[PDB]
């Protein structure tokens, strides 16, 4: 299982798991990119590092991470990956989605958590490229496959 999950900001400050936004503000922190996510699996410390920035969550099954990986210097372009807890395998999640019969390019933008029937499901918010409409995309980390897409606002 995934333990001791820590996100390290470019300025070195460490975000503990489930540290809240209000706790960060109360410490006097400004927004800052996260350049490393680190965690324990069995007897190993594992990490992913991106100097361009990344957004990482532990999937509630505690055996996958969802990693939104910045692809350039802007913080916008990004690719979503599901990484196994032992960090040995990963899957790139599709960001060209069939929406109303049309193949739609877009960009994964941030994570949210909704009630789910399985802890293996996480949610990533998807910005459709052609009109920036937001879609909630639920993904089963145990298979690496999209479960459902719903228009959001």
């Amino acid at each position: 299982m995934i333990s001791d999950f820590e996100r390290i900001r470019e300025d070195g400050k460490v975000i503990d798991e489930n540290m809240t936004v209000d706790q960060m503000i109360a410490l006097g922190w400004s927004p800052c990119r996260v350049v490393e996510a680190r965690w324990r699996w069995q007897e190993q410390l594992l990490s992913v590092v991106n100097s361009r920035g990344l957004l990482a969550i532990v999937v509630p099954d505690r055996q996958h991470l969802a990693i939104l990986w910045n692809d350039d210097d802007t913080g916008v372009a990004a690719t979503l990956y599901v990484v196994s807890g032992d960090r040995q395998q990963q899957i790139r999640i599709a960001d060209q989605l069939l929406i109303n019969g049309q193949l739609e390019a877009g960009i994964y933008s941030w994570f949210e958590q909704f009630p789910q029937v399985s802890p293996s499901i996480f949610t990533c918010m998807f910005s459709r490229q052609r009109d920036q409409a937001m879609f909630r995309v639920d993904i089963d980390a145990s298979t690496g496959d999209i479960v459902s897409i719903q228009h959001s606002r």
């Binding site: 996100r7 936004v21 503000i25 927004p31 990119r33 957004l55 994570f111 949610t123 920036q132 606002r153």
Partner: protein, 119 residues
């Protein structure tokens, strides 16, 4: 989302124009982690409470479970918007000005997220 029988304008606003934007829990977490996690809707006037975000801005629970934070966004280049009055949806009344960002989202956050009081 818009009030029936009212005009929804399409505008281009200059850089430096600021709006208030309600952000959900994971959205605010991404913002605190340096991501431009901007939604499509904002407000030209202050957003005083979560009750206001729900009833007046008609931000539905199904879309944003948590509306406990607000950010200030500022346009960084000319920005296309829709402008008009919120319409009622579910058991919410609407009735205040909102803007919708059209096309490219040329925004940046100003400061850090603020806390919205429940009431």
């Amino acid at each position: 989302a818009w009030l029936e029988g009212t005009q929804v304008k399409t505008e281009i606003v200059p850089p430096g124009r600021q709006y208030q934007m309600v952000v959900a829990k994971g959205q605010a977490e991404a913002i605190m982690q340096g991501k431009p996690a901007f939604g499509g809707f904002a407000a030209p006037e202050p957003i005083p409470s979560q009750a206001y975000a729900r009833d007046k801005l008609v931000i539905l629970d199904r879309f944003k479970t948590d509306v406990s934070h607000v950010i200030t966004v500022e346009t960084t280049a000319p920005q296309k918007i829709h402008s008009g009055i919120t319409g009622p949806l579910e058991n919410y009344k609407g009735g205040v000005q909102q803007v919708e960002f059209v096309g490219d989202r040329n925004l940046k956050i100003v400061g850090t997220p603020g806390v919205l009081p429940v009431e």
